[PDB]
Every structure is written in C-alpha cells, then in structure tokens.
Amino acid sequence: LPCRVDGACDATIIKMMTDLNKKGIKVASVGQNYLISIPASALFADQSPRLNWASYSLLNEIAAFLKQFRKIAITVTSYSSKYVSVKRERALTLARSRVVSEYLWSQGVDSRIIFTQGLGSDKPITSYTLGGDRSPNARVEITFRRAV
Amino acid sequence: LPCRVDGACDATIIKMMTDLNKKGIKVASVGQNYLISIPASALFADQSPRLNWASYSLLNEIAAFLKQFRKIAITVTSYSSKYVSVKRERALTLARSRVVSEYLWSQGVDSRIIFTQGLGSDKPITSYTLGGDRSPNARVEITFRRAV
Amino acid sequence: IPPSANDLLLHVLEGVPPPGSRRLVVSGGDARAWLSNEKMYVRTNLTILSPGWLASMTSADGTHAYEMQKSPVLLVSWHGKVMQLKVEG
Amino acid sequence: IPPSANDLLLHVLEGVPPPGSRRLVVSGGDARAWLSNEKMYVRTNLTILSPGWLASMTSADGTHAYEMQKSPVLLVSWHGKVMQLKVEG
Amino acid sequence: KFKKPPINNPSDDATIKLAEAAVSVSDSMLEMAKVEKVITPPSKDNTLTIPNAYNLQARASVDWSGPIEELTARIAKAAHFRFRVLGKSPSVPVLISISTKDESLAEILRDIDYQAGKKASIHVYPNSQVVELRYAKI
Amino acid sequence: FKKPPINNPSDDATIKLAEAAVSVSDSMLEMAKVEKVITPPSKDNTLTIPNAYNLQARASVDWSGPIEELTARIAKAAHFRFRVLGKSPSVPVLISISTKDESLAEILRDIDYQAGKKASIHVYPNSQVVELRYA
Amino acid sequence: RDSKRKIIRDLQKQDIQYVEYGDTRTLIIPTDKYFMFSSPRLNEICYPGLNNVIRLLNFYPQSTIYVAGFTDNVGSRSHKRKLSQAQAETMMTFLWANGIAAKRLKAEGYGDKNAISDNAIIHGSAQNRRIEIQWF
Amino acid sequence: ALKETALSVGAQAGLAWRAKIIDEQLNKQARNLDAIYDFNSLVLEHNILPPVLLEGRNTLNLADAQSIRISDRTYKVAKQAHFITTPPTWRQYLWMDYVKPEAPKEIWCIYTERGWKNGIDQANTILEENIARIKEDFGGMILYRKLLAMNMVSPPYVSHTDLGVTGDGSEIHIDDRVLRITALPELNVNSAEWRAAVAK
C-alpha cells in the first residue's frame, strides 16, 4: 500500500519543537519556512570552530527534528560577534557552518542540498555586543522551506 | 555431497595456535599471512644443522598445524647468530632450513612450494647478541599465506 | 520522413484524456496516466527517468506530457530525489 | 575456412548466460556453467585440464570462457593443485 | 585470544556480488580514462570560464539526480547571483546527478559543467552577478 | 555524544562497493574533463550586454518564430533603429524566447546565442541601432 | 589493572591488533572502524581505542616510530597512494599532538603495496585497509 | 513425495524472501549504484546510447582434428547504438520482482528448510545474472569509449535536417528538426589508422 506517514508524526514534530524551545533553540516557523537557531555557546567553545562532545546530543535531536520534514535545501549559516578581524570572523563562521553541515549530512536528514555559509557579524539580531559567543548575536541557524 | 570442512576445524586452529604460543613457538597471524616462529635452540642443537630427537614431536605438532590451512607456498627461512663467518652462517642456516623443510615435506603439508632459505643474521629481531643458538635472533620461521 | 508527435499529446498536455481511453491510477506522485491503445500517456510536472518515453510535449507552465509503453513503474525525479510511481493497468 | 570461435564465448566471457540455455551447478570451484544446445559453457579463472574443450576466450583480467561437450566432471588446475568439479545437467 | 583486526558488520552476498562487479567496472573505467587522457591531452580547465568569487566561496553539500536548471537556480539563489538561461532547453532533459559533500560552489559549478558536458555549459560573470547556463546547439 | 553516519559503509562489502563508487565517479569526472570542449571567454564569440539605459528595461516576451521580426520589435521597444545586413534565407532561422521578466539586453544575448552561426547581432549604442547580420 | 597486558587486552576488544616481534612492535589499526570513509578525517566516535594506543606508546618513550598507511586495490594508484599517505599523516599528527616528539615519528603511505591479505576477496580487502605502527 | 512437495513449498517462499531482502539491499545502496552505473554520463552527442562492445582475447576454436583457428583479440558490436530518450538506470537490470506468494510434519520441516535454502541460492543466481547483464552492458559502453579513443570504431553520424514552419493551416510545427543516424558505429578494418595509448 501507499504509506500514510513518512516515518514522521506531527505530535513528535511539535514535541521536538516545544523541547527545543524549552532548551532555548529558537524554532520559528513562518508558513512553510522554518528557522532553527542554535546559540553558538551551546555548540562550540568560545571563538573556535570545534564542537563540544555534549553538543552532539543537541545535534542529534535537531537532526531528528530535520528528519521529520521533507525538504529540498537546508541552508545553515553562522555568525558571531567580532573577535579579531572580520576576515577571521568569516573564516570562523564558515568553518562552524561547515562542521555543523558535515555532521548533519552524516546524520539522517533528507535534504538534497545543504548550503553552508558564515557571515562576519554582518547580520546581528541585537545591538547588544557585550558577549563573545555568549551574546545572542553569536548563533548558527538552520533555514529550510518544508516542501509540500 | 560436497564437504563442509577440509579435514580442519577452527577450534583446532586456535587450540594449536595457543598451544604453540604456550610452548614458546610464537605464532603471529597478520591478515592472511601466518608466521610461526621457532627458536633455534628449541629444535636444533648448538651451531649445527642436526635436529634433536625430541624436537620431532614439536615438528609433528607444527605439521599438524600446517595440515589445516590451504596454501600455495610455504617459505621456511632461518638465521642464526654470528659465529665464525657469514659464509659458514649462511651454509648452516641453508642446511637447517632445508632439513626442516625436508621433514615438513615428508610430513603432510598440502603445499605446492616450500621455499627454504637461510641468512647470515641479516635480519635480527633484537640488538641483543647474547650468544649462539640461545639468542632469539637465532631462529627458524615458517611464513605462508593462507589461500582463500 | 518520421511522424511529428502524437497530437494526442496536446490533449494530455492538458488534463483531458484521449477519446476512447481507460485511465490508470497513479500513486506516489502528481501524475495522471491514461492508456489509449497499447500506449500510456502521462501528464506530469515531475520528470520521468527510468522506463523511457516515446514522445514528449511540455506546456507553458512546465507540465510535461509523455507517450510511452505500458509500464507499471514510473520512476521520477521530483527535485533531485528519485522516487517511484505505481500505475495499475 | 574454419569458424573463428563461438561469439557466445563473448557472452560467457562475462557472467551473462547464452540466450535460451540451462544453468548448471558447478560444485567445487569458482566457476559457472551453462548448457546452450548440447554444449556446455564454463566461465572460470581456473585452468581446464581433463575433458577437452572445443573453444576458448580469455578476458582482460584473465577469466577464461570455454565451450566444450557435456562432461559431468571437470578437472582443473587451481594453483597447481589438480581438482575436480561436479556439474549437474 | 586471537583476533584479526577489522571485524565489521555482517554483509550479505548482494553487496558482496555488487562489490566484485563494482571493482571491475571501476578499474576498466579508470583505464578508459587513462587511454582518453593520453590520446587527447586535456588542453585547459573550466576555471577561466567559471571563476571563483566572494560569496561564490560559500560551500554546499549535495546529492541530486534530476535536471540541471533546478539545481543551478538553487545554487545561484543561495549564492545571490542572478541565474539566466541562454538557449532553449532540449526535449530530453539534461540530467545530472551529483553526490558530493562540503564542496565550494565554484567547484560544484565546475563539475556540474563537466557532468553536463557537450549538452550544456555554465558561465559565471563575477564582475556582474550572473550565473548563465548555455544549452547546446542541437 | 554522537553517532555514526546512518547509511555509512560500516560493513566490509559496502566499503569496497562505495569506494568503487567514488573511484568510478572521479574517473567519470576526468573523462568529462578531457572530452569537455570549453571555449575561453575572450574568444567566446557571443554578444556582450551593451549596457544602454534603454536596453536595461525589464521586458517580457513569449514568442517563437523567425529572428528579424522579434529583433525589429525589441529595437522599437528600446527606441533603437533596426538594420539588417545579409540575406534572409528560405528556411528561416528560428528562435524560441519565453520569459515573463527579462532585460532586453539579455533577450538580445539570448537571440544572438540561439542564432549562433546562422546569424548574428551587432548593437551600436552610440548611434542607437541594432543590426541583424546573416552570412 | 592499568598495565600493558590489560591495555592490549581491551585493545583486542576494541579490535586494534597488536603483535610483538622481538624488538619490533606493531599495532594494526583498521581504517574501516577507525576512520571516516575514504577520508583522512578521524573517526572520533572510536576515540577510546585511540586513547588506548596512546596509552600503549606512552610506555616506549625512546623508540623511533614508523607509521605506515595502507589501502586495498580499488581506485587509481595516485588515489591509493594519496589516501593512504593522508591517513598515515593524520595518524602521525594524532600521535604528535598527543605527545610524541616530532622526530620520533615518520609517516609513510603505501598504496596497497605490502598487502597482508589478497585483494580479490571482500574480507581480505577489509583486512588490507589498515594502519601499521612499528616501533622499537 | 510429501518431502518433495514440502521442498517445492519451501522453494518459492525462500525465493521471494531472498528477492525481497536483496531488493531492500539494492535500495540501501541506491546513490552508490547510480554512481556506479552512470549511463547518463556515458551517452553520446545526440542522446545516443552507445553500443556494447565485447572483447575476447586468446581465442581458440578446434574445428576438427586437423584445423584450429587462433585469434589474438576479438571485438563484437552487440546491441547497437541508437537514439535514447532517458538513460537506463540500474533497476531495469538489477531489480528483482517481489510478489508475496500466498500459497501454503518433521520431514516437512527439514525438507522445507532445504527448499528454503534452495530458493535463497536460486534468487542469488538470478541476482548473479542481473549483475552479469549490467556488467556486460556498462563494460561495453566503456569499451566503446576506449575504442573510439583508440580510433577503432566509427562515431555515429547524426544528420539534423531542419525544416521551417511545417504543415497546413490545421497544424503547424515551428522549428521542425528531424534528426537521423546515417552512419551506425562499427569497427573499422583499415587497421593502420588505429591509435596507440602509451601512458606513463
């Protein structure tokens, strides 16, 4: 027979969405666009493209979140506050986005393209620049339009 | 009917391997190459290509271990420690390797080639040069590749 | 000189079936297949990849319409994804 | 002028059987055999020794194809060891 | 206790058989590439007609099997380049199929251009912001 | 804590099959590299964008047929003169252009590309005249 | 309980092989379980085997170390040589970064050329993809 | 005889079970399999599916007691070059047909396990012939590209005769290009025009 569910349930979709918003992962969903932003202190160390070992469980549960949707292209991008220079900032953030797309492409997502890029403090979402990677300007976001 | 085993069991492989390693015949097994390693005092006498009478039981368990695999060519090579000359050394180890290959050929191996050679301590396995045939550099080794 | 296409492909470039057909039920994707006389005709906007079609047309909005032989499996590219499609008949 | 080989040996040079043949079970070595029309065809990389073959080809990687009469026993050189293979058919 | 080192998962004979077919078609393919690249030496690359750029240096990781124009429009949409088509697309599709992981978009366009060799071409004009796709003449 | 990859070749036949797949993929890539004819863009022969402000208007045309008529009407859309040098043949050289938003400089580049070697487009923005030449 | 017999016994349980031969000792580390696939990026989910091999050659602080990397027969000769070269180099940097001096280490990647099993069979090619670490 | 109908009860069930198991094994390796059997990157200029050249070296035929024939290398054009619309996937060759058979004591059990193993290796031989068929076809197209590089075969000669707007007032077709294959690919027998691939 043709399948009813696609290996996914809507109750598990909203259970993962409430669990990620309880853990401070900002999960916005505007129509069919979906945006999951991790704060950068929850994944990496300070001003470094290196994951903590505890953050791979967080990457496992957002990988289980992206398993539930049928999509085309995940774009992961990252940005952080200014540390030394904007060239080191762009290299830092595209390295951070490329290791998070390396783990998400290794894991079970069903996206055909994953774009990965980093910006050197070029889109801050607050004007408060008091932190390093503790500031909520420093983040890595996962943007995809869920297909049909 | 076609046969399950070729007159050989895997329990008899590991039993003869651990019994030879208990007796001090070092049986390494890398991939599909097999190396059994007899010290020269354990089978020959001192500086002599004459096998002792008690060592034929050791060669009976060596040939009963070598009955169990399928192989194309067994190379038996030997080298003893530096005694009078390198020409005396190479003639002694050539005669030693051909008499232990003569006994292993008259016993049942299923091999097609036995390559016998001897070297004049050209490959030591320690820098300790303690004596004559009591040294672990003074040895005969039986090396082959298990076929399929 | 070979023939041009089928001009039945202009009808199945819309959703209108050929005269004197029997429709097939396409599962697993947005396609409509009819079978007129030992040929099936499938109106898609996914692109058929595996069985090999005999004639094709495409309208203004990227709808394709294929004429092919009777095959029970279509295989399509959706969006870089290879999927399969069932027909019955 | 004689014939050159069989060009069925080009097909049984690969694993693909001759058309309208019957499979045989080669037991005792890595070989396959078919039976096309009162002639068996062996694909192997062993050397056929006893029963007399009528035709052979050999690939780039050294697997041979043999056309011979229906012998129930093949004899082979594996690597100098002389072995037998049973066929059934 | 004795143990040979790689103790992997249990396979089955489907993937065993597909592996031993796969290695033969692999090395016959690479010696076919050897005879082709030694009878014609390769004259030039395609990096002078697809040059790299800032914001073309963003990366992507893509498995894809369909036609070309959807994939090139999606990478140029992510790379902020106006994508344009020169030449009408033929009646058969130009199917390309790419499985790479963490590759920059200029090299993804370069092996897209090699994958749709002799049927299509990609050109990037990076003093403007346009990725153009050229269909063939036939 | 992390995981392995999901359909990783964690299995002794699948690593040989999948590294065979990457070897046939890059040998496909270098046979594509060697038989891929490219042209350099200094000798690419196609028409550049002539950057006139009348030619930077975003037009819209779906039409298929012979070239001289469309190039005449985009010249009078951009208030350019339209010259034609050469002879129009008995079989006409045919274009298909369907776009609902394009700059007509790029429609001129597309019509020069689909002409190719049957015809060609010159454009003189100083005298404000496009020109279809045959051969 | 923290000695050499215990750490090679759970190195055997973590399926890295270890042979003693006279003064030479060689570890054999399978790339199929201890590397990511066709890549020189390290499989860091099998980190306790790598912690056990750096706990093994913490015991031998004066020997020079051959690290050689191996493949099987699939690919080009340049592909096999470059992939085993890169894998032997990143095991060399793992040992150097976990505290062996840089002139004790020497990486060398042989493209399948020593071949401790055959490459015509599946389990033999799996045994051919390996890392040899020889020291004295 | 009751053991024999137990055996043929086990045969078709083990055949369809093994066929379903290797169907999921084939679907598990799907990106690797279209990476291997890239027919889409092996078609020619005008979506010509290239022909299947077969190679046989060291060819003996014993014709009688008195005459044999050796030849050094033979090439045969099986399955000639043609127009294709879509490239072939693996799954016309490799995929096995799974229907679940709804067709149902001590020697029934042991002969039905013997029949179940007979159905399992019977489906394995069908998969062996399917990988044989795809290895023959893909090695033939690779061998076509090798002999076209070696100047041993002719490339196919298309001919696109263009027509203008065509037909009467009831039907036009605007750009009417009819594309034929005039010259099929074939092995050329003027043997001095071949090319020698010496690489380094």
Q: What is the 3-state secondary structure (H, E, C) of chain B?
A: CCCCCCCCCHHHHHHHHHHHHHCCCEEEEECCEEEEEEEHHHHECCCCCCECCCHHHHHHHHHHHHCCCCEEEEEEEEECCCCCCHHHHHHHHHHHHHHHHHHHHHCCCCCCEEEEEEECCCCCCCCCCCCCCCCCCCEEEEEEEECC
Report the distance separating Cα E43 and Cα E33, nearest Å: 15
Round to whole Å and give the CA distance between D22 and D34.
Answer: 6
Q: How many other CB atoms are found less than 10 A from the CB of residue C43? A: 24
Euclidean distance between the first and the last CA atom of chain B, given in angstroms as a whole number: 21
C4 vs chain H: nearest CA distance in angstroms?
Answer: 8
Check: CB of residue H186 under 8 Å from CB of residue H193. Answer: no
Question: Is C1 in Cβ contact with H89 (below 8 Å)?
Answer: no
Q: Which helix (H) or strand (E) element contains residue E15?
A: helix E13-39
Residues in C touching A112 (Cβ below 8 Å)? 79-81
Helical pair B10-22 and B55-66, crossing angle rounded to 10 deg? 150
**H179 interface with C at CB cutoff 8 Å:** no
Q: How far is residue B125's CA from residue B136's CA, in Å, rounded to a whole number?
A: 7
Q: For residues H77 and H62, what is the distance between their CA atoms, to the nearest angstrom? A: 24
Q: Do chains F and B touch (3 or more CB pairs under 8 A)?
A: no
The DSSP bridge partners found for residue H177 are H162
Tokens of E74: 């999606």
Report CA-CA distances (Å) from G91 to B55, F12, G4, G39, G88: 44, 22, 21, 12, 5
Indicate the pairing of strand G65-69 with strand G105-109: parallel
Residues of H with Cβ-Cβ distance to F7 under 8 angstroms: 28
Which residue type sits at H59? T
The CA distance from H190 to H193, in Å, is 6
The verdict on a CB contact (< 8 Å) between F23 and G79 is yes
Q: Which of H85, H170, H178, H179 to mutate to test the interface with C (most CBs of C within 10 A)?
A: H85
Tokens 């003093």 -> residue: E127
Contacts of H157 (CB under 8 A, 6+ apart): H181, H182, H183
Amino acid at H24: E
For F130, the enclosing helix (H) or strand (E) is strand F129-133
Residues of E in contact with H85 (CB under 8 A): 92
Question: Which of G5, G14, G15 would best serve as a mutation to test chain E binding (most E beta carbons within 10 A)?
Answer: G15
Q: Would the CA dihedral through H101, H103, H109, H113 be positive or negative?
A: negative
Instruction: Give the SS3 label for residue H144.
Output: helix
Cβ density class E96-134: b for 16+ within 10 Å, e for less: bbbbeeebbbbbbbbbbbbbbbebbbbbbbbeebbbbbb
H-chain CB neighbours of F25 within 8 Å are 35, 38
- Give SS3 for E108: helix
Three-state DSSP class for residue G55 = helix
Closest in D10, D15, D56 to H58, CB measured: D56
Check F91 against H162: CB less than 8 A apart.
yes
Measured from the Cβ of residue E11, the count of other Cβ atoms closer than 10 Å reads: 21
Q: Which of C56, C77, C82 sits opposite E67 (nearest CB)?
A: C77
Residue of H22, H37, H150 with shortest CB distance to E35: H150
Q: What is the DSSP letter of C7?
A: G
Residue F24: closest C-alpha in chain G: G75
* Measured distance CA(A28)–CA(F47) in Å, rounded: 46
Counting one residue from A and one from F, how many pairs have CB atoms under 8 Å apart?
21
Q: Could you give the angle at which helices G47-56 and G77-97 cross, rounded to 10 degrees?
A: 70
Count of residues making up chain E: 138
| Residue H136 Cα, gap to closest chain D Cα (Å) | 6
Residue E4: DSSP 8-state? -
Q: Where are the beta strands (DSSP E) in chain E?
A: 59-64, 82-86, 98-104, 120-125, 130-135
Q: Nearest CA to CA, how far is G127 from chain F (Å)?
A: 9
How far, in Å, CA of B62 to CA of B83, rounded? 28
Cα-Cα-Cα-Cα dihedral sign, residues A77, A80, A86, A90: negative
The residue type at A59: L
Chains touching F, CB cut-off 8 Å, 3+ pairs: A, E, G, H
* Contact (CB<8Å) D79/B2: no
CB pairs under 8 A between B and G: 34
Beta strand segments in chain A, E:
26-30, 33-39, 73-79, 113-119, 139-145
For residue F57, the 8-state DSSP code is -
Q: How far is CA A78 from CA A64, A119, E135, H6, H64, in A?
A: 20, 6, 36, 65, 79
Q: Nearest Cβ partner of C80 from E64, E92, E93?
A: E64
Contact A57, A103 (CB under 8 A): no
Radius of gyration of chain D (CA): 12
Q: G69 pairs with which residues across the strands?
A: G109, G131
Q: The tokens of H176 are what?
A: 């009417």
Q: Report the length, in residues, of chain G.
A: 136
Q: Is H188 on the interface with C (CB under 8 A)?
A: no
Size of interface B-E (CB pairs under 8 A): 6
C49 contacts on E by Cβ (under 8 Å)? 65, 95
Strands of chain H (E only): list them: 48-49, 52-62, 68-78, 82-83, 157-163, 176-183
Q: Decide if B30 and G24 are in contact by the 8 Å CB cutoff.
A: no
Whether A28 and chain E come into contact, CB under 8 Å, resolves to: no
Judged by CB atoms closer than 8 Å, whether chains meet at E74 and A105 is answered as no
- For an interface test with B, which of D25, D46, D79, D83 has the most B Cβ atoms less than 10 Å from its Cβ? D79
Cβ distance H36 to F24 less than 8 Å, yes or no, reads yes
CA–CA separation, B67 vs B49, rounded Å? 25
Length of chain C: 89
Distance, CA of D5 to chain centre = 14
Nearest residue, CB atoms, C52 vs list H85, H167, H176: H85
> Counting Cβ atoms within 10 Å, is residue F101 exposed (0-12), middle (13-18) or buried (19+)?
exposed
Q: Which residue of H has its CA nearest to C5?
A: H173
Closest CA to G109 of G93, G78, G88: G88
SS3 state at D66: strand
Question: Tokens at residue G48, please?
Answer: 């306790």
The amino acid that residue E88 corresponds to is: K
Spell out which residues of chain A touch residue C80, defining contact as CB-CB under 8 Å. Answer: 72, 112-113
CB E89 within 8 A of CB C62: no
Report d(CA H115, CA H121) in Å as an integer: 10
Q: Which residues in chain A are contacts of F5 at CB distance < 8 A?
A: 106-107
Q: Dihedral sign for Cα C11, C12, C15, C21, please.
A: positive
Question: Which residues on F lie below 8 Å from A61 (Cβ)?
Answer: none
Helices A10-22 and A55-67 cross at an angle (nearest 10°) of 150
The alpha-carbon gap from C64 to the nearest alpha carbon of chain A, in Å, equals 20
Token couple for B61: 């368990």
| Chains C and G physically touch (3 or more Cβ atom pairs below 8 Å) | no
Chains E and F touch (3+ CB pairs under 8 A): yes
Report how far residue A85's alpha carbon sits from residue H56's, in angstroms, rounded to the nearest whole number: 65
Query: Residue C31: exposed, middle, or buried by beta-carbon count in 10 A (0-12, 13-18, 19+)?
Result: buried
Residues of E with CB under 8 A from a CB of C: 62-67, 70-71, 91-93, 95
CA torsion H32-E44-F113-H43 (nearest 10°) is -30
Interchain CB contact of A57 with F (< 8 Å): yes
